[PDB]
Amino acid sequence: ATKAVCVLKGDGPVQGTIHFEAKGDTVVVTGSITGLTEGDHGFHVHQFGDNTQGCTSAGPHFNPLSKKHGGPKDEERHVGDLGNVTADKNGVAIVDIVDPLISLSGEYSIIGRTMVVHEKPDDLGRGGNEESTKTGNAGSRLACGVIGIAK
Amino acid sequence: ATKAVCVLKGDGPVQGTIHFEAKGDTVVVTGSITGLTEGDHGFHVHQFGDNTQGCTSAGPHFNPLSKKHGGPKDEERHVGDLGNVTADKNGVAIVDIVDPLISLSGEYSIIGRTMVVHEKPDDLGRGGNEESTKTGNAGSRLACGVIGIAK
Ligand SMILES: [Cu+2]
Ligand SMILES: [Cu+2]
Ligand SMILES: [Zn+2]
Ligand SMILES: [Zn+2]
């Protein structure tokens, strides 16, 4: 696949549409999310594209290389760690990321997995408690969607 | 990828959870759909896992081999043609399908595509008209969901 899309929905007002495109050897992530509180929100690819229990059955971060959580720029990060998206005054976050670890095919493929937008800022694995090394203290899953093949 | 799951949702009362498991060279499809009118309903894998416009953005049946519409037991069928599911008087259809053409990996992989349950019975390509050979005359998309990787 060269293009993927994900529609984020949850139990509150958070909603959004993320597009994924393979450009060269990398993947470009674009889109926008509305209904968010102002500030940073953890944005990650969770392992399972299972929405049987809402965002909860999405499991933990996609991590085929079995590393600890980190920011998008660290070496020690989960493949699913895309950092934070930032909502403005109006609750709108515009997504514009380029990432070297996720893919739309092969072992690092995120097609069929779940994009999750979190309630709090991701601390990038530097919070200092065990939880930081797992989820960055990003908190609850406000909205999520299964990543599908797009036209 | 040996297991997948799909949660079907739409704008009406139809809902369901479909599970997929690779067994030998086949995919075993199980689950249930509720809120359906009694009788047969076409059940197919549509090409895109794009839910930006509901079930409509899912595109047509998944047909990598450029064949016409048929029933699951036909040689001339789309890879996404799984036939019909049957809802009882209470509106519940129990799904139990074994299929050798769809797959959870490789070229015919349905991971990231869309499972759709339709309003009318699928005529299996034997309706006598032209639509019969494209869609089985299954009617509207009652509920759909993106097929994701399951634990
Ligand atoms: Cu997360
Ligand atoms: Cu169909
Ligand atoms: Zn992580
Ligand atoms: Zn068909």
From Swiss-Prot, chains A, B:
What's one GO-annotated cellular component?
neuronal cell body
* Cross-referenced InterPro entries: SOD-like_Cu/Zn_dom_sf (IPR036423), SOD_Cu/Zn_/chaperone (IPR024134), SOD_Cu/Zn_BS (IPR018152), SOD_Cu_Zn_dom (IPR001424)
Location(s) in or outside the cell: Cytoplasm; Nucleus
- Sites bearing N6-succinyllysine, chain numbering: 3, 9, 89, 120, 134
Q: Which cofactor does it need?
A: Cu cation; Zn(2+)
In the UniProt record, does the keyword Membrane occur? no
Residues at which Zn(2+) binds: 61, 69, 78, 81
The record's annotation in PROSITE patterns points to: SOD_CU_ZN_1, SOD_CU_ZN_2
List every position bearing Phosphoserine: 103, 105
> Please, where does S-palmitoyl cysteine lipid attachment map on the chain?
6
Q: Which residues carry this modification: N-acetylalanine?
A: 1
PTM info: Palmitoylation helps nuclear targeting and decreases catalytic activity.
- The superkingdom of the source organism is Eukaryota
Query: N6-acetyllysine occurs at which residues?
Result: 120, 134
EC no.? 1.15.1.1
Give me the reactions it catalyses. 2 superoxide + 2 H(+) = H2O2 + O2
Q: Which major enzyme category is it?
A: oxidoreductase
Binding residues for Cu cation, per the UniProt record?
Answer: 44, 46, 61, 118
Say what the protein does. Destroys radicals which are normally produced within the cells and which are toxic to biological systems.
Query: Which PANTHER family does the protein's record reference?
Result: SUPEROXIDE DISMUTASE CU-ZN -RELATED
**Family named by the database record:** Belongs to the Cu-Zn superoxide dismutase family.
Other comment = Chemical modification of Arg-141 reduces activity by 80-90%.
Protein's name according to its UniProt entry: Superoxide dismutase [Cu-Zn]
- Please tell me the species this chain comes from: Bos taurus
